[PDB]
Amino acid sequence: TAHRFLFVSTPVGPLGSGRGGGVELTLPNLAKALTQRGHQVSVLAPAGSVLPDLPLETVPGTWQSTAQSHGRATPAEIPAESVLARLWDRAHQQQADFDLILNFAYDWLPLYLTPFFKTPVAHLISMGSLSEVMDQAIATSLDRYPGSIAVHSLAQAATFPFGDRCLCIGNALDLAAYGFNPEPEPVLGWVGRIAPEKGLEDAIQAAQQAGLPLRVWGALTEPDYWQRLQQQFGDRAVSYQGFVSTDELQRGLGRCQGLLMTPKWVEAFGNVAIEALACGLPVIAYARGGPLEIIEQGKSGWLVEPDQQAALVNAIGQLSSLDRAYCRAQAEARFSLAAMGQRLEAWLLPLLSR
Amino acid sequence: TAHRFLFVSTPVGPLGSGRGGGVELTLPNLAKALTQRGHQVSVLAPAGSVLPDLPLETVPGTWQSTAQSHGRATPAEIPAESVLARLWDRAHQQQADFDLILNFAYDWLPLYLTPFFKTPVAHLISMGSLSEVMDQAIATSLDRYPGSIAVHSLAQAATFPFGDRCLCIGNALDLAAYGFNPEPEPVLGWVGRIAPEKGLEDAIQAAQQAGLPLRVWGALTEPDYWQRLQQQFGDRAVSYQGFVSTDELQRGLGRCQGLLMTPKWVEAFGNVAIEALACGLPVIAYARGGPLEIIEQGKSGWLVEPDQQAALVNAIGQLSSLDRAYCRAQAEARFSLAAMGQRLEAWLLPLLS
Ligand SMILES: O=c1ccn([C@@H]2O[C@H](COP(=O)(O)OP(=O)(O)O)[C@@H](O)[C@H]2O)c(=O)[nH]1
Ligand SMILES: C[C@H](O)[C@H](O)C1=Nc2c(nc(N)[nH]c2=O)NC1
Numbered sequence A: 001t002a003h004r005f006l007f008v009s010t011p012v013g014p015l016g017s018g019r020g021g022g023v024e025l026t027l028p029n030l031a032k033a034l035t036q037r038g039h040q041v042s043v044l045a046p047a048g049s050v051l052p053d054l055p056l057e058t059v060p061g062t063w064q065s066t067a068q069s070h071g072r073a074t075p076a077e078i079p080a081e082s083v084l085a086r087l088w089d090r091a092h093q094q095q096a097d098f099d100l101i102l103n104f105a106y107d108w109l110p111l112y113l114t115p116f117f118k119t120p121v122a123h124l125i126s127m128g129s130l131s132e133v134m135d136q137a138i139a140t141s142l143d144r145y146p147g148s149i150a151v152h153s154l155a156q157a158a159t160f161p162f163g164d165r166c167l168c169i170g171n172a173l174d175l176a177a178y179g180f181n182p183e184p185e186p187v188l189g190w191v192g193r194i195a196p197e198k199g200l201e202d203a204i205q206a207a208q209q210a211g212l213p214l215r216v217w218g219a220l221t222e223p224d225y226w227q228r229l230q231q232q233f234g235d236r237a238v239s240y241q242g243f244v245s246t247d248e249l250q251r252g253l254g255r256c257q258g259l260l261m262t263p264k265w266v267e268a269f270g271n272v273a274i275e276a277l278a279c280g281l282p283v284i285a286y287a288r289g290g291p292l293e294i295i296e297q298g299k300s301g302w303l304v305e306p307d308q309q310a311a312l313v314n315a316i317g318q319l320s321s322l323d324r325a326y327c328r329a330q331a332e333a334r335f336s337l338a339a340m341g342q343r344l345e346a347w348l349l350p351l352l353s354r
Numbered sequence B: 001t002a003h004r005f006l007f008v009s010t011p012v013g014p015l016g017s018g019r020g021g022g023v024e025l026t027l028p029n030l031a032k033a034l035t036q037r038g039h040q041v042s043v044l045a046p047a048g049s050v051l052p053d054l055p056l057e058t059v060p061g062t063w064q065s066t067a068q069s070h071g072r073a074t075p076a077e078i079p080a081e082s083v084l085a086r087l088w089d090r091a092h093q094q095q096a097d098f099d100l101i102l103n104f105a106y107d108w109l110p111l112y113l114t115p116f117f118k119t120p121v122a123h124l125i126s127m128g129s130l131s132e133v134m135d136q137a138i139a140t141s142l143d144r145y146p147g148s149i150a151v152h153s154l155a156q157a158a159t160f161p162f163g164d165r166c167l168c169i170g171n172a173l174d175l176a177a178y179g180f181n182p183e184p185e186p187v188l189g190w191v192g193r194i195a196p197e198k199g200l201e202d203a204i205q206a207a208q209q210a211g212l213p214l215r216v217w218g219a220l221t222e223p224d225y226w227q228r229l230q231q232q233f234g235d236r237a238v239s240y241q242g243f244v245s246t247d248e249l250q251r252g253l254g255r256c257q258g259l260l261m262t263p264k265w266v267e268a269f270g271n272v273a274i275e276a277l278a279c280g281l282p283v284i285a286y287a288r289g290g291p292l293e294i295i296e297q298g299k300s301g302w303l304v305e306p307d308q309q310a311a312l313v314n315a316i317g318q319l320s321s322l323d324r325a326y327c328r329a330q331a332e333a334r335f336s337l338a339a340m341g342q343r344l345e346a347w348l349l350p351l352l353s
């Protein structure tokens, strides 16, 4: 029997701006996974948002500040004109139009509201543990609503004390949108929000030492940090490609011999890793966080000692030995929408009948 | 036509502690105003709250930081282990046991939560405008739920641009606990924190120029400040008579010929003037804020130019122009539990469905 789902997006910025990071890819991909199984999905998101094909409703208001820019004792914050508050008021108004509401925001409010809704609310947690108030809000929702919380990786789950009670769903891509490129140019790629946690400094330095140009795609979400990188490395240290659509990303990224992933934080998953593999691009990453669950050492990439420049330079030197077709094959075997649709249904359907 | 109400207290501290502020007096007095009319009132409050005579359930967690400590653009905040959040989760769980829920907290969350409740929620807003996020939340609940918001003073109300749509329910005391003293001693009273920047020097200086000792009730935190006062004004100018518990306050304050109210504008809202009037003590207050609405000029007291010693002294010299019995009469007509009960029923009963 087909069901009706409402997906409520992240409040940090509009879908398509890049402010929401990987959520802006994950949400529509999970929506596609369900619509391909016959369900109806609608989306609620901040004003300015764009989404192909699906019903979308947008709500004006002030964006949430990013959780990772605050320390562990920070209170939850609700700004004047908050888009997050507005989104949840609207969800509540329309709750009887859906069988289940799926929250994508790493915020206290929607977790707190869950028992205030009649319709069931489930939560996909995008990041590892960041704050006491969030840890507690997730715990409480789990205590009352077992099975209602999903995560992307076991490494992510292990950052929380209750991580074994979270379901790991991994992630998936719309594989039809990615072209396999068997013949790369002698250049490296890096893809991400241009934000301190992503460690772009490390990748610039490693590419310069390896002697290879670095092409950078990503949203300029932190203009102060971007100017600091310019101050340190100069304006000609990276070739900046802008923030681009999935179709432009996959064409550009496919041309690279490898994707460097150099996060300062513990990455929960890292959509860009699976996007690279989908284009036949091997991934060099630190052996920390989600990439440990994505890459196969010496087959689809390199997992190197965290935070060591020499290891990254060495890995760059061993890209030519990896089979790009193998990377692509791994993407097809593991990261399909069809398989995600199965995992979503196994997660969400039992929450409808209790 | 009796109903069952749930009162949810302020999250700034327990009831009985002093941190609850004016809510310490207001919530029990409004509850009595309703229980004396045959309704049932239960209370939810933070851990450590004490409230004789009413069903009371307490909730653990971190106190909310005071709204006045934050600037106008600051977001609403919910701390880890928030007592405010826990209060409202617990109210929601038990909402079907009540006809109406009355919020006393000057906080974003309860206003926002109002449409998530099936049971009606009303809000008694205790302060004037302090932030954008609180102002907008009150506006929204007014637009969606006309008549659902009350204030204590017509002024506080005017600090908001939608003030005209708030109901003023005024203020109440348990007048049966205050004795009328028709014959005072030749002394003046002052009630407040006994701390710098509270206007105490202004009052001592005026009483002294007028030739009367000053008796004070309140909290002392800095004994060095007390010594400073004694050294400046002489040890006969001012004396400490107690703290502010109702029985000690009513016994002591009624002996005064007048109460001097010399607060800074921030703390210029209301309560102690009605305690004075309830004892038959006329009030001499700076002519700003809450006292403008409470005192009837030249009848129950004198409203004077702020920060001017000559205006206090002139007023003190005209305390014999004022009828103590009339001060008490005004208290019984405006500030009784009976009169508050009437205003509360007028406010809250139309909101029942
Ligand atoms: O030019 C770009 C650069 C990045 N991205 C997207 O940015 C997201 C970054 O997500 P990831 O999970 O790698 O990191 P997060 O930002 O969530 O920490 C990925 O989904 C990319 O597809 C994009 O659409 N266009
Ligand atoms: C990085 C992750 O994909 C996502 O960009 C984020 N979501 C959120 C965030 N911060 C808040 N407060 N809420 C979110 O939904 N920071 C980052």
Ligand SMILES: C[C@H](O)[C@H](O)C1=Nc2c(nc(N)[nH]c2=O)NC1
Binding pocket: B010, B011, B012, B019, B020, B021, B022, B023, B064, B065, B066, B067, B068, B104, B105, B106, B107, B126, B127
């Ligand atoms: C003045 C009022 O009676 C009461 O003392 C206050 N309540 C509150 C406050 N601040 C917050 N956040 N919430 C309250 O309920 N400050 C003062």
